[PDB]
Design a protein around this nucleic acid. Structure first.
Ligand SMILES: [Mg+2]
Ligand SMILES: [Mg+2]
Ligand SMILES: [Zn+2]
Lengths: 52, 153, 71, 190, 71, 196
RNA sequence: CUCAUCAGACCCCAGAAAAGGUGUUGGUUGAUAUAGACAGCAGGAUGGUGGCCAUGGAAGUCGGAAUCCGCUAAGGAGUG
RNA sequence: GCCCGGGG
């Protein structure tokens, strides 16, 4: 399939993210506030959901 | 040839499935008796899953008994065994004595990663009330005996 | 349980219109007396605890109440 | 609060000849020369010590948004110093599931031809930024190496390759194929 | 059913209690005004926190029950 | 509680000062936990090693500015992962017990070996597997008859050179260690005299 | 003081709220700090214990009740 | 002033 050394590399830019609940922005994994002005830089963040 | 390897049995009561085979099976000696081949010279346990690291010879095993402290203070005052029923109030009840403190704090001297036995008559006593047995009371009576007045090597 | 009180009233705030403050009171529970003076004035038998709150005992009744309190 | 002075100094090695014409920085090393301009910031750039040992950055009378631009200049000049001494090497790896990603490098290392990214007949042509060498690394199956002196062109070119090999209209957490920056180091180690 | 609370937020009218002049008044949504250990003594629960209003406004009984359920 | 344990750590330094007016300033990073318990339990009457923050003991010199005038020349010496040894017995017996106090641990991926490290040429006893990580620079491997046989001795680590990640992982799957855990000395202070 | 990729701009008055913001500025309260802190970079994570009770087996690493000791700089019968 | 540190 894909070796896990490459799979962690792909998952780093594809799903190791935090998502703003208000504006669905794809944020860096250590984000506390969203970067977009449209959500008022809100702190309502959830982890990006993982595939099963 | 002398062998040393980790081992986990049920002790004396009959189990359903062996817990010894995936390492000591290809070791040449009999992997069949090991459900109670660690019960050669128990004497006291007879119903408890005892954790043993012993010395293994190429024909059959050799007597080396290293207990739990929980097992050591369960078998300070002996409780009767039970079968696979395993009913409630099998937690240990019975007042441990100072004699049963200082007889099996000697099993804490010969591991020798501690203080002297003065430090371990608190160690096995701190195991004692966790496993459910007391020396004339719980810790606000045990530490009363232990301060300046605990008999010791 | 102070932070639990503050978060409970802060959550209950959203059910209410307008602006509400959360204020930790100076008093002792649901009483009119200050929490600092409360315990020694219980000790001096100025407040007798009576269920949820207290009853104030002034120096003004008949002396048979004082004897019953100081027996 | 207007802080009266925010300063930070950067130590400059023996190997590097540095110069300044106001708020442009001209760093010279073994690998070439880097100019970067900073007239958008309004700082004091001092070049102190004879033989030009320390580059010092001053911001006088700045609020927080102006104080934050001192260490940014120092980190940019440091990145230019490591660009002319040690270079920048961005090592990208080409993750695929079923369709092998075929990468052909053209024009001395200045154009990438990406083919069979997820079984597409469309060929992606990625032109490099000027001065960035692009190369397929030996002793590794699916890897690509970007080498240069400007970090902001090397990493932008890596971003161009990465955003050119993007999966569309599927679930990207399952369709993980693409060419991704895996290692960030220098051309010449130390 | 019932109007939003912005229709009756402000204390515009005179006070109008239920009495022999106001009949056919439905019961309030809030009925219980005390929750938790009502039977707790005065020395068991010393710390008191208030939700204090900051406006001359009108709080509905529905809101007074919703906030006590939330708290 | 901690507000008296600060001055109680100071008073533990005082307990060592009130028995022993000479210092073996040991600089020992990454030492083992149970073997350091054994360090306390070995020469327990005559020496013990304490662990802690170097700047408090350098402030304790100015705390003893003129009540312990021996330790005044011990301020600009303390650099590194430093413990204190306080002894009365000699310069020989405690030192050559601390010299051989050793324990092995697998080759660290990110640390250094201070001498010239060799490779054990023997069999491993396990069958066919991947190979080229040992030929990453050219060192030969002769896989035959199941067991993994090495031809000769081309040495691992040169003195003054680091031990990287891949080559340490090679020895981590091989259970080979360069040297053991050492309680290495930096500088000593003997009874009002500073040597190395 | 404030930057608005919806700025703001003067009684009546001519358009906005709850809620929210690591935008930026101030202030209040409490700690945790030169008996040297906070990041960051490394190192140790110990024996009693592989814990009675359940569960086939769970040994700090599914669960509920036990949550003491000592050598200690430290380590919860252990956050994943 | 004296001590430490580095820049001429
Ligand atoms: Mg679809
Ligand atoms: Mg009206
Ligand atoms: Zn957002």
């Amino acid at each position: 399939i894909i070796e896990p050394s490459l799979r962690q590399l792909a998952q780093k830019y594809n799903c190791d993210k935090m998502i703003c609940r208000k504006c669905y922005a794809r944020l860096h994994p250590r984000a506390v506030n969203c970067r977009k002005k449209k959500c008022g830089h809100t702190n309502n963040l959830r982890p990006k959901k993982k595939v099963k | 040839e002398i062998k040393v390897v980790y081992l986990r049995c049920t002790g004396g009561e009959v189990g359903a499935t062996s817990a010894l085979a995936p390492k000591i099976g290809p070791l040449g000696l009999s992997p069949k008796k090991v459900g109670d081949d660690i019960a050669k010279a128990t004497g006291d346990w007879k119903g408890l899953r005892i954790t043993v690291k012993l010395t293994i010879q190429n024909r059959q095993a050799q007597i080396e008994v290293v207990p739990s402290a929980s097992a050591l203070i369960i078998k300070a005052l002996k409780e009767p065994p039970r079968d696979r029923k395993k009913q409630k109030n099998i937690k240990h009840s019975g007042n441990i004595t100072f004699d049963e403190i200082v007889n099996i704090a000697r099993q804490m001297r010969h591991r020798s990663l501690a203080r002297e036995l003065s430090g371990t008559i608190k160690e096995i006593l701190g195991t004692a009330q966790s496993v459910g047995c007391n020396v004339d009371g719980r810790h606000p009576h045990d530490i009363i005996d232990d301060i300046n007045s605990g008999a010791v090597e | 349980n102070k932070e639990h009180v503050v978060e409970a009233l802060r959550r209950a705030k959203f059910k209410f219109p307008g602006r509400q403050k959360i204020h930790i009171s100076k008093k002792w529970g649901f009483t009119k007396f200050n929490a600092d003076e409360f315990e020694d004035m219980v000790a001096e038998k100025r407040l007798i605890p009576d269920g949820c709150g207290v009853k104030y005992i002034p120096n003004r009744g008949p002396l048979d109440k004082w004897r019953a309190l100081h027996s | 609060m207007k802080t009266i002075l925010s300063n930070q100094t950067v130590d400059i090695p023996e190997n590097v000849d540095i110069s300044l014409k106001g708020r442009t920085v001209i760093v010279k090393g073994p690998r070439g020369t880097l100019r970067r301009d900073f007239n958008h910031i309004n700082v004091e750039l001092s070049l102190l010590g004879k033989k030009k040992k320390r580059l010092r950055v001053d911001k006088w009378w700045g609020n927080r948004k102006e104080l934050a631009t001192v260490r940014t200049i120092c980190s940019h000049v440091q990145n230019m110093i490591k660009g002319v001494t040690l270079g920048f090497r961005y090592k990208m790896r080409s993750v695929y599931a079923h369709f092998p990603i075929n990468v052909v490098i053209q024009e001395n290392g200045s154009l990438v031809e990406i083919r069979n990214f997820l079984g597409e007949k469309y060929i992606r042509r990625v032109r490099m930024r000027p001065g960035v060498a692009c190369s397929v690394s030996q002793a590794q199956k699916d890897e690509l190496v970007l080498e240069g002196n400007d970090i902001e062109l090397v990493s932008n070119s890596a971003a161009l390759i990465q955003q050119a090999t993007t999966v569309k209209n599927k679930d990207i957490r399952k369709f993980l194929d693409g060419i991704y920056v895996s290692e960030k180091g220098t051309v010449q180690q130390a | 059913g019932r109007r939003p609370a912005r229709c009756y937020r402000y204390c515009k009218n005179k006070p109008y209690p239920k009495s022999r002049f106001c009949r056919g008044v439905p019961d309030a949504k809030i009925r219980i005004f005390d929750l938790g250990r009502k039977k707790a003594k005065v020395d068991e629960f010393p710390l008191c926190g208030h939700m204090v209003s900051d406006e001359y406004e009108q709080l509905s009984s529905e809101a007074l029950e919703a906030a006590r359920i939330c708290a | 509680d901690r507000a008296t344990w600060k001055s109680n750590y100071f008073l533990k330094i005082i307990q060592l000062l009130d028995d022993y007016p000479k210092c073996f300033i040991v600089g020992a990073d990454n030492v083992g936990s149970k073997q350091m318990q054994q360090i306390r339990m070995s020469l327990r009457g005559k020496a013990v090693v304490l662990m802690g923050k170097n700047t408090m003991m350098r402030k304790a010199i100015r705390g003893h500015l003129e009540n312990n005038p021996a330790l005044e020349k011990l301020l600009p010496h303390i650099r590194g992962n430093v413990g204190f040894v306080f002894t009365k017995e000699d310069l020989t017996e405690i030192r050559d017990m601390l010299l051989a106090n050793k324990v092995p641990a697998a080759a660290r991926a990110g640390a250094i070996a201070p001498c010239e490290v060799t490779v054990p040429a023997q069999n491993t006893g396990l069958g066919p597997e991947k190979t080229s990580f040992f030929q990453a620079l050219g060192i030969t491997t002769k896989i035959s008859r199941g067991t993994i046989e090495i031809l000769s001795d081309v040495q691992l680590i040169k003195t003054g050179d680091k031990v990287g990640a891949s080559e340490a992982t090679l020895l981590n799957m091989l259970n080979i260690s360069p040297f053991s855990f050492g309680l290495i000395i930096q500088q000593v202070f003997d009874n009002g005299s500073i040597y190395n």
